[PDB]
């Protein structure tokens, strides 16, 4: 079952890639969707047999590296955590492919698009089911290979080409650090296995765990797109809408979290790393909430929502509650897949295929089905009580306060603002596109219809999960004392008791009261008092709006300063060293010298008795002078060359 | 409409809405291959996999920790 669950997407990607010509467009898509569906059903069988029946599977293909003590196998295991990640991955990716059967129907290249997409799913499957860090690293890179090919799928488009390169180069920045982390893992323990390294966590020096895990954190910042290495995340919207759904809900944007959760047995023995993740995971949630409220492109808003939600898991990791970060990861993949799908449905329906929500308006009745999916998903995103995002996101916000440390208090407000902004940019997104006065021309509104039933099925199925998924699965992960040793919690880091019992009675409602209560106020302004927001007149507001709309001016800082300086150092090396000092101490310089020396020596060979006779008699001086004067005659000779 | 230059450009993934005339025949040849391999992969998965929590009983481990002592 395991071998069927892992490699089924792979042969699906090959068949579309290598036989897609011989079986055409229609069959290539469906055979690919079949391969992911085979892995979905196989995964669910193992989920039952692993999570409930306490069983583990390990297929070890063969040996990979056997350099003295360092031994690495092509070994694949499925523990509780490996199968806890194969539900969000394979399930969502199957619906994405089912969704993408119809979304890409008007695109000429559908055999290549699906070949990449199933390749991307296979790499992520290999990423989470590998039994050591190297097998993880193999899938960790083909995530970036498949994402680069997916993001730049429309290679004729200049913008999609460079945004694909921006994703690959920034990810390879973390990949370089991830490799360096593995080397210090071999240096300290001579192994990269899970069964070995985690069994030695306490006995190892604290400084060594920090060196390894800081590298893991930097690598995870790249994939999960946290502050500092996040400029690429919003450039990723150049790919087709299905790519954004699969890569920002059930793939690499979450792979940064998995690496930290997998290495929990080491992460609990270096609290400095946890403290850094708390701040990186708190600052990122704050920023992308603030950026989203003044973002106009619809897919940018949802993409920024992913960065804020993904950062929420980071602070859950920071307080050593890995069970909370894992459970929210599952719950987030459900509605956030739906929101991108519903965004794709809206843009497909409008015949101009616009994306600026400033050219929408009054869509709620022409596409009632698309609107409801956003409505139910957004409420699940905003943690309305009784939904799925409520039972996973809300507890994390409590546990920031339940930590009862300085950092927990400061991050508590950054997180609470993130919950606030989530409830705000959602309301801004829904009104501007479904309830506002129309902005598009009339001919668009007379030609606005929903989409085919193939495109409709995946959304409704994710909607149901966004209403019932979190409640059913809550006790499997957040259960008080459920055996989940794959995530290791040192006894001095458990605060789930005080998170649930000791919190002030006003905080337990604080996110929701500013959530919907603050939502109405903004709704009225957008509806009844829009004159306040005519911000171009106010220079204080225009400066503030420009700053956050330009994403903290971080994108301009990277390109204008950091990248160009990096390329400039290449130029200075290419000018003053390679064609500079090395040619002066090389071909060009020695040609100049030899031209000077040989031009003197040619002037000396001439038939003349007086010249040859005078030279001979000078040489009799070498018999007269004492031999210690030779070097002075050596210098005098060198002078007359000049 | 526009021209795909399909006389020579024949990539493995077709190109610009490519569909061969005998596509129904080839798919059944391909649908066999997916079925042939999925069945084949299931056999190997059952035969070559194991449970890494039952290979050694705790009674055997308890001798290992003491022997290393």
């Amino acid at each position: 079952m395991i071998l069927l669950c892992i490699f089924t997407p792979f042969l699906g990607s090959l068949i579309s890639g290598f036989f897609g010509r011989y079986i055409g467009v229609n069959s290539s898509k469906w055979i690919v969707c079949l391969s992911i569906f085979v892995s979905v059903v196989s995964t669910y069988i193992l989920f039952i047999d692993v999570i409930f029946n306490e069983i583990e599977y390990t297929y070890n293909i063969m040996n990979w590296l056997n350099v003295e003590y360092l031994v690495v196998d092509w070994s694949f295991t499925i523990d509780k955590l490996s199968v806890s990640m194969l539900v969000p991955v394979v399930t969502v990716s199957f619906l994405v492919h089912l969704y993408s059967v119809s979304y890409m129907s008007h695109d000429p290249h559908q055999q290549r698009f699906f070949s990449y997409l199933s390749m991307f799913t296979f790499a992520m499957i290999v990423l989470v089911t590998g039994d050591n860090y190297l097998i993880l690293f193999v899938g960790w890179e083909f995530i970036g290979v498949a994402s680069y090919l997916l993001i730049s799928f429309w290679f004729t488009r200049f913008n999609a080409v460079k945004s694909g390169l921006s994703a690959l180069l920034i990810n390879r920045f973390g990949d370089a650090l991830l490799v360096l982390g593995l080397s210090y893992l071999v240096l300290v323990t001579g192994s990269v296995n899970y069964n070995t390294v985690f069994a030695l966590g306490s006995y190892l020096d604290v400084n060594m765990i920090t060196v390894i895990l800081i590298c893991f954190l930097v690598a995870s910042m790249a994939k999960s797109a946290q502050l500092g290495l996040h400029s690429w995340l919003l450039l990723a919207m150049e790919g087709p809408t299905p790519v954004s759904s699969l890569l920002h809900a059930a793939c690499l944007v979450i792979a940064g979290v998995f690496l930290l959760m997998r290495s929990s047995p080491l992460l609990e023995y270096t609290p400095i790393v946890l403290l850094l993740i708390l701040w990186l995971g708190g600052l990122s949630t704050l920023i992308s909430g603030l950026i989203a409220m003044v973002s106009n492109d619809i897919k940018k808003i949802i993409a920024l929502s992913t960065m804020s939600q993904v950062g929420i898991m980071m602070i859950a990791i920071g307080v050593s509650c890995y069970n909370l970060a894992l459970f929210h990861l599952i719950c987030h993949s459900f509605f956030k897949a739906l929101l991108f799908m519903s965004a794709g449905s809206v843009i497909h329906s409008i015949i101009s295929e616009y994306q600026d929500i400033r050219m929408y308006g009054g869509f709620r009745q022409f596409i009632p089905l698309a609107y409801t999916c956003i409505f139910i998903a957004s409420l699940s995103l905003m943690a309305i009580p009784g939904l799925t995002g409520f039972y996973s996101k809300d507890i994390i916000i409590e546990s920031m306060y339940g930590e009862y440390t300085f950092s927990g208090f400061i991050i508590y407000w950054f997180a609470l603002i993130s919950a606030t902004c989530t409830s705000l940019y959602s309301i801004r997104l829904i009104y501007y596109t479904f309830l506002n006065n129309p902005n598009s021309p009339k001919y668009i509104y007379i030609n606005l219809k929903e989409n085919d039933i193939v495109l409709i099925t995946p959304m409704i199925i994710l909607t149901i999960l966004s209403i019932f998924g979190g409640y059913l699965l809550r006790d499997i992960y957040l259960g008080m004392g459920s055996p989940f040793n794959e995530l290791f919690i040192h006894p001095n880091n458990l605060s789930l008791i005080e998170t649930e019992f000791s919190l002030p009675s006003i905080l337990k409602v604080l996110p929701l009261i500013t959530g919907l209560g603050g939502g109405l106020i903004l709704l009225l302004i957008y509806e009844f008092n829009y004159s306040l927001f005519l911000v171009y007149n106010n220079k204080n507001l225009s400066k503030l709006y420009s700053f956050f709309n330009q994403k903290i001016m971080f994108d301009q800082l990277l390109n204008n300063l950091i990248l160009r300086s990096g390329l400039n150092i290449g130029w200075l090396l290419n000018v003053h060293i390679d064609r500079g000092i090395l040619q002066l101490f090389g071909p060009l310089g020695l040609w100049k010298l030899s031209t000077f020396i040989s031009s003197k020596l040619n002037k000396l060979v001439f038939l003349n008795i007086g010249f040859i006779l005078e030279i001979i008699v000078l040489s009799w001086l070498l018999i007269v002078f004492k031999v210690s004067l030779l070097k002075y005659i050596l210098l005098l000779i060198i002078f007359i060359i000049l | 409409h526009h021209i795909h230059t399909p006389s020579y450009i024949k990539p493995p993934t077709g190109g610009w809405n490519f569909t061969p005339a005998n596509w129904k025949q080839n798919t059944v040849l391909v649908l066999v291959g997916f079925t042939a391999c999925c069945v084949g992969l299931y056999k190997l998965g059952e035969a070559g996999s194991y449970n890494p929590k039952l290979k050694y009983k705790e009674e055997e481990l308890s001798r290992w920790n003491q022997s290393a002592k």
């Binding site: 010509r21 | 809405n17 490519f18 569909t19 061969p20 005339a21 005998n22």
Partner: peptide, 10 residues
């Protein structure tokens, strides 16, 4: 209509 006919036999 798409009206894209099948290509040759492969």
């Amino acid at each position: 209509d798409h009206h894209t006919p099948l290509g040759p036999a492969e």
